[model samples]
Target chain A: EDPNAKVIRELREEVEKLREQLSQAEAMKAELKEKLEESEKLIKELTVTWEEKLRKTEAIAQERQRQLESMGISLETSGIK
Target chain B: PNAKVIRELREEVEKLREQLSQAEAMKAELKEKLEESEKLIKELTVTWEEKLRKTEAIAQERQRQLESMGISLETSG
Candidate 1:
């Protein structure tokens, strides 16, 4: 029954080592998925923030234009007289 | 001279003075025109200054927004 040499035991040990490496690889895959999710969340937040800033700037422009009109100033054609 | 000749001469003098006054009025109007034109130019300059300020701000804002979106702003400009 002992036809195999001591190298058989070494081969079995190497198989266990490979199984351990596979488990580690699965864990890394999970971590990478979490990192991808976090990145997506960050991009969404950045887009919303940028949009809000654009709207705020637009409001400021409208208010400034209204103030100019109140002063009887024309904004077109280089303030034509 | 009689009263009629004196009256006629008085009317002529009055007519000449009226023409002189009209010419003087026209000269004053020309001066007023120059002042008003300068005032209008000043007002226009101020108004354009405000407009250009706004335009620059908008350009900067658009550049910022497009840059955030990973779009090229200067190339489009």
Candidate 2:
């Protein structure tokens, strides 16, 4: 059991007593699972948000970049575009 | 102890143990997940902030573009 938990502790006592109470254990597990699901949902939202921003940024950047390139601003060295 | 009593005791203890172990594992995994979530949130916050700044920069750039080119999006259509 100790090996199973990376942070296993050694003591001169019974394992059952030290193990988490049944009610508390179940509650904690439920909480963690809920949090994990929440995190997943948050990431999904962030992905959509960033994608929108990236598209707008790309659109504007490309438009200006094109104009600069047309005006003989060699993008090879100026980095302005 | 009675035969039935011994059997029930053993079963109960094992079930309790199983639940406890599984819970611990789930908690550990969730801890790692929470960390990753926090990192992503931080990164996105930073990205959004930079995007906001870039939006401002782009606005300034557009003003420059208009002044230099003698054209304005306000009227360029």
Q: Give one digit per residue, the lDDT tens place, for model 1 in A1-81.
A: 133434445455655555555555555555555555565565566556655655666776666555545444543546755
Instruction: Write down the DockQ of candidate 1.
Output: 0.00
* Backbone clash count, each prediction separately: 0, 0
Off by over 4 Å in 2: A1-20, A67-81, B1-15, B51-66, B71-77
State fnat for each of the candidate structures.
0.00, 0.31
User: Local distance difference test, per candidate?
Assistant: 0.55, 0.67
Once superposed on the true structure, which residue ranges of model 1 sit more than 4 Å away at CA?
A1-3, A70-80, B1-56, B59-77
TM-score of chain A considered alone, across all candidate predictions: 0.75, 0.56
The stretch of ten residues in a row with the least summed lDDT in candidate 2 chain B is B1-10
- lDDT (10s digit) by residue, model 1, range B1-77: 23344455445555655555555555555555555555655665566556556765975665555445445434565
Q: How high is the lDDT of residue B59 in model 1?
A: 56
lDDT of 2 by residue, A1-81 (tens): 335232222221224553546567667767877887898798889878877877787677677757755654654467664
